[PDB]
Scaffold this active site. Structure first.
Site, mmCIF file in Angstrom:
data_model
loop_
_atom_site.group_PDB
_atom_site.id
_atom_site.type_symbol
_atom_site.label_atom_id
_atom_site.label_comp_id
_atom_site.label_asym_id
_atom_site.label_seq_id
_atom_site.Cartn_x
_atom_site.Cartn_y
_atom_site.Cartn_z
ATOM 1 N N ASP A 97 4.864 40.455 127.569
ATOM 2 C CA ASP A 97 5.405 41.517 128.407
ATOM 3 C C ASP A 97 4.546 41.711 129.666
ATOM 4 O OD1 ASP A 97 6.613 44.882 127.521
ATOM 5 O OD2 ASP A 97 7.303 43.395 128.986
ATOM 6 N N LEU A 104 6.729 49.230 117.918
ATOM 7 C CA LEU A 104 6.734 50.687 118.005
ATOM 8 C C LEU A 104 5.930 51.113 119.228
ATOM 9 C CD1 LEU A 104 5.891 51.326 114.223
ATOM 10 C CD2 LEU A 104 8.177 51.608 115.226
ATOM 11 N N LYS A 105 6.633 51.574 120.259
ATOM 12 C CA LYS A 105 6.010 51.874 121.549
ATOM 13 C C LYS A 105 6.604 53.097 122.253
ATOM 14 C CE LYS A 105 6.689 47.821 123.496
ATOM 15 N NZ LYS A 105 6.492 46.958 124.697
ATOM 16 N N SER A 106 5.785 53.730 123.096
ATOM 17 C CA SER A 106 6.175 54.903 123.884
ATOM 18 C C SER A 106 5.030 55.323 124.805
ATOM 19 C CB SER A 106 6.537 56.076 122.963
ATOM 20 O OG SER A 106 5.436 56.430 122.143
#
Ligand code: 778
Ligand code: FPP
Ligand SMILES: OC[C@H]1O[C@@](CO)(O[C@H]2O[C@H](CO)[C@@H](O)[C@H](O)[C@H]2O)[C@@H](O)[C@@H]1O
Ligand SMILES: OC[C@H]1O[C@@](CO)(O[C@H]2O[C@H](CO)[C@@H](O)[C@H](O)[C@H]2O)[C@@H](O)[C@@H]1O
Ligand SMILES: OC[C@H]1O[C@@](CO)(O[C@H]2O[C@H](CO)[C@@H](O)[C@H](O)[C@H]2O)[C@@H](O)[C@@H]1O
Ligand code: 3FX
Ligand code: 3FX
Ligand code: 3FX
Ligand code: ZN
Lengths: 485, 315
Positions: free
Chosen positions: B137, B102-104
């Site tokens: 990443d 869950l990323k942003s």
């Protein structure tokens, strides 16, 4: 016209050399090179007369792309909840793409677009990613909504432009609430600070005639300090403790370079003293052209050094080229013609690699192997437009604009937040209004500059650099708010 | 089976507010039962500006379904400060968010706000977390920008020791050893060695940096990241190109090139740019124009137009 823009098919395609040092970067690169080159091999050269037998035809499948956009414009499945805070972008990506594709919406559909967006407008100022009773205002949907209203709206009571005019003071106040002393803006209350916010704000402020000295203070310095040693621009700069020095906070990226170049360009038409602080235009141009991929990766643009080519950067990087070019031109004139990127190769990437395979969903994409989407459809097409049409900022056009400007016509001036935050006097405000308006309408399509790879059926409409809406949308929209109709 | 919030006794006092889309909106999303219900109640909660535990729980429900919902994230942080919640516990939840994919922008900004408010005396454990998060990443743009902020913010507070700067350079060197083509790591090196206020930029320090850059070039001659760093370095410190030319000259045909590594076809386009720019430095405009012409017509034809522009600039 094409002497310095060789076709990908006329060049030798070879992998990026390894130098006998494998790494994760190169593993990804070689894999991507394979995906793109193999599709180019299966596809007929768009330039060829004898379009060879058995090979895929690369013509722009405008009707497939129209259907793609239509099929998601009136209903989106539950999974699209990931973009619930970005619905004005879904609007913008669609209506701008259709504009580029030359597909008209009927008035009934346009009225729905206007209604949808106006419900996103908060009385306190600005548009959010959804209805005002659901989401708070945000700089990015404010740009997306305003541009969408330029595309789908009109000057009648149901056209939405009236609503924007009435909202000018509140939008300005929202912009000022976003302002930080160092020249940065928060994208929303308690939100992040980067050049996307600056760009979106400056576009809207320019279009709606709400620019003041207090709004712009340090804004030029923030943007200028985003430039990295590579020549492009990072997301943000950090002010070290008015500040002793400002330092870029990440890599030069196509997205942030686009926003920075465009922001800087908008600032150059505001006649404030020793403003805006200069950028290194030649370094920005160098970085831009260096991001155009090799023949094996189809001549598309990558977003940053040693990363992958991607169709959306045709707009973000490609669309920054004419801005960087103009800034370089001005600098050389201050001290005292072939295309600057491969306009042909970029169109070839779009036609050959960025389109969805025929007879399917349609839409344009990042690269082969990626599902098409609205975002990539819009940005591929916006980039294709920049490549097809030689856009230049014309001093003689700007001069003609100055000569026809009527300063006695205009909407009420915004009331500044601070008493001394406005223009010194009416003469200086009107001079600024003239400069901002005249330069905003300075972009022209160069006569004889058109290169439509694959023939005239591939032609899409001409987008305007900096703003990314059609000139035919930009002109009546900005004329309305400056009362220059 | 999902239990509607209208049937829950904990929410009985709350009257939900429907989304104000207006008539026949474009791009409507067919929200799941769960998301619609949560938003209906959030609308009511936020309108009345309720700062409570149930409101906090609700914001977590929503951001799990939509990590990009900036309005809800803004409300969540207001809740954390109003309720005097453990911000260290919230950080741990943010770690879980990354693990749960869950990323942003919003999650990373929330993390920034938490560290700003917690304001630890030594941010080493957060620095360590960030290093570890880069493993799956290594080029995540948000993470790199956050790392820049973390060191910048806490250094202004005088909270980064020389040992901490030293280990950070050690870590950056290892990242570049693992992948020399990681442009994000090169950018971090620039911060550590050049741009940060406390960067050591003495004469011998610049000598050591040049050695590092050239050795990186000799290891991977076609590495655009290494060339951009070299050119950026010489430009920033106003250093002549000519004295370093012997180290670059073999790529146009202090540490010198290796027999060259296998799979190194010549010439390297950016080595030619270096050669051409060195000619301009020597006021040899004709020789410079000749190199730009070769780049345009033979050695970097994709940029045929750009190199022609550079060629014409000499004449
Ligand atoms: N912002 C941003 C952004 C971040 C990362 C990228 C990187 N990128 C490149 N190709 C695809 C991407 C991933 N993007 C898709 C569009 N998008 C988005 C959503 C809403 C609005 C807008 Cl304009 C964009 C995102 O947030 C994430 C691109 C754009
Ligand atoms: C007006 C406006 C909102 C502009 C935004 C412009 C834009 C495209 C920004 C990108 C920002 C970013 C964090 C990219 C990295 O994503 P990634 O790592 O997924 O992509 P990459 O591999 O290409 O760098
Ligand atoms: O290139 C100028 C102009 O010629 C047209 C046909 O009128 O297309 C020709 O040139 C293209 C680009 O060089 C080729 O891809 C095409 O095959 C050729 O017919 C127009 O489309 C173009 O604008
Ligand atoms: O997060 C709630 C908290 O923020 C404030 C301003 O600091 O109000 C904002 O959030 C509300 C709910 O989304 C919006 O109605 C309002 O427009 C916005 O400014 C505080 O008032 C509130 O307690
Ligand atoms: O072999 C290098 C030599 O080939 C050319 C074209 O003749 O470039 C090709 O090979 C490069 C890899 O070494 C690629 O980067 C390039 O895209 C490809 O055209 C010459 O430019 C180069 O000197
Ligand atoms: O979007 S495009 O590819 O340009 C156009 C679509 O493919 C439609 N092709 C039709 C197939 C049946 C015969 C009539 C044409
Ligand atoms: O005062 S106005 O801005 O015009 C109207 C209200 O503030 C809107 N507040 C909303 C509550 C629900 C969450 C999103 C914000
Ligand atoms: O206008 S020109 O560039 O001279 C030529 C036309 O555009 C060619 N378009 C093709 C027509 C036949 C179907 C596939 C496209
Ligand atoms: Zn993309």
């Amino acid at each position: 016209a094409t002497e310095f823009t060789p076709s990908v098919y006329s060049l030798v395609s070879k992998p990026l050399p390894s130098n006998s040092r494998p790494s994760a970067t190169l593993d990804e690169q070689a894999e991507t090179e394979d995906l793109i080159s193999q599709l180019f091999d299966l596809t007929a050269d768009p330039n060829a007369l004898v379009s060879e037998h058995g090979k895929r035809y690369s013509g722009l499948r405008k009707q497939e792309h129209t259907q793609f956009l239509a099929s998601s414009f009136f209903q989106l499945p539950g999974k699209f909840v990931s973009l619930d805070a970005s619905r004005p972008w879904l609007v913008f990506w669609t209506v701008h793409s259709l504009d580029l594709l030359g597909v008209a919406l009927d008035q009934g559909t346009k009225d729905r677009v206007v209604s949808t967006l106006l419900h996103f407008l908060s009385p306190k100022g600005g548009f959010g990613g959804g209805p005002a009773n659901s989401q708070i205002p945000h700089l990015l949907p404010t740009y997306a909504s305003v541009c969408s209203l330029a595309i789908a709206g009109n000057d009648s009571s149901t056209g939405g432009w009236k609503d924007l005019a009435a909202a000018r003071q509140s939008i300005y106040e929202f912009f000022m609430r976003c302002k930080r002393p160092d020249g940065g803006f928060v994208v929303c209350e308690g939100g992040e600070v980067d050049v996307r916010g600056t760009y979106c704000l400056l576009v809207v402020a320019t279009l709606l005639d709400i620019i003041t000295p207090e709004l712009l203070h340090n804004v030029d310095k923030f943007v200028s300090a985003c430039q990295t040693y590579e020549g492009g621009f990072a997301c943000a700069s950090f002010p070290f403790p008015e500040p002793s020095c400002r330092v870029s906070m990440a890599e030069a990226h196509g997205g942030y370079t686009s926003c920075s170049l465009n922001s800087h360009f908008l600032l150059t038409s505001v006649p404030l003293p020793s403003f805006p602080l200069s950028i290194d235009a030649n370094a920005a141009l160098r970085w831009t052209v260096l991001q155009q991929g090799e023949p094996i990766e189809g001549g598309g643009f990558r977003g940053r050094t040693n990363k992958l080519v991607d169709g959306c950067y045709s707009w973000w990087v490609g669309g920054g080229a004419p801005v960087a070019e103009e800034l370089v031109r001005r600098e050389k004139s201050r001290k005292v013609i072939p295309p600057i990127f491969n306009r042909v190769a970029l169109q070839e990437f779009t036609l050959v690699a960025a389109q969805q395979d025929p007879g399917s969903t349609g839409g344009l994409r990042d690269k082969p192997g990626k599902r098409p989407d609205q975002y990539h459809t819009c940005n591929n097409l916006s980039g294709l437009s920049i490549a097809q049409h030689k856009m230049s900022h014309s001093p003689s056009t700007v001069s003609s604009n100055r000569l026809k400007f009527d300063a006695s016509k205009g909407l009420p001036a915004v009331k500044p937040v601070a008493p001394g935050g406005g223009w010194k006097n009416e003469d200086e405000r009107q001079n600024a209004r003239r400069e901002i308006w005249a330069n905003a309408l300075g972009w022209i399509e160069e006569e004889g500059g058109e290169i439509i790879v694959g023939g005239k059926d591939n032609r899409i409409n001409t987008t305007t650099p900096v703003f990314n809406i059609l000139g035919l949308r930009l002109k009546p929209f900005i004329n309305y708010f400056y009362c220059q109709e | 089976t999902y239990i509607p919030m209208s049937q829950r006794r904990s929410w009985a006092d709350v009257k939900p507010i429907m989304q104000d889309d207006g008539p026949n909106p474009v791009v409507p999303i067919m929200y799941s039962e769960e998301y619609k219900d949560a938003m209906d109640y959030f609308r009511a909660i936020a309108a009345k500006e309720e700062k409570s535990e149930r409101a906090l729980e609700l914001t977590e429900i929503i951001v799990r379904m939509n990590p990009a919902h900036y309005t809800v994230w803004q409300y969540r942080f207001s809740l954390l400060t109003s309720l005097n919640k453990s911000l260290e516990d919230e950080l741990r939840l943010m770690n879980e968010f990354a693990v749960q994919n869950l990323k942003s922008y919003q999650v990373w900004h929330h993390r920034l706000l938490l560290l700003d408010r917690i304001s630890p005396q030594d941010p080493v454990s957060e620095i360590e977390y960030i290093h570890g998060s880069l493993l799956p990443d290594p080029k995540n743009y948000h993470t790199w920008a956050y790392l820049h902020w973390l060191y910048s913010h806490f250094s202004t507070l005088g909270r980064i020791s020389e040992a901490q700067w030293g280990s950070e350079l050690d870590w950056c060197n290892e990242m570049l050893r693992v992948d020399g083509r990681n442009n994000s790591a090169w950018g971090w090196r620039w911060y550590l060695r050049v741009s940060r206020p406390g960067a050591e930029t003495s004469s011998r320090s610049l000598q050591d940096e040049l050695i590092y850059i050239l050795k990186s070039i000799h290891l991977i001659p076609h590495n655009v990241s290494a060339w951009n760093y070299l050119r950026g370095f010489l430009k920033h410190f106003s250093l002549p190109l000519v004295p370093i030319l012997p180290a670059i000259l073999p790529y146009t045909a202090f540490p010198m090139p290796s027999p060259l590594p296998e799979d190194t076809p010549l010439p390297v386009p950016l080595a030619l740019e270096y050669l051409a720019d060195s000619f301009i430095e020597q006021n040899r405009v004709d020789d410079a124009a000749k190199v730009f012409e070769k780049l345009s017509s033979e050695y970097d034809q994709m940029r045929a137009g750009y190199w022609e522009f550079r060629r014409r600039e000499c004449a």
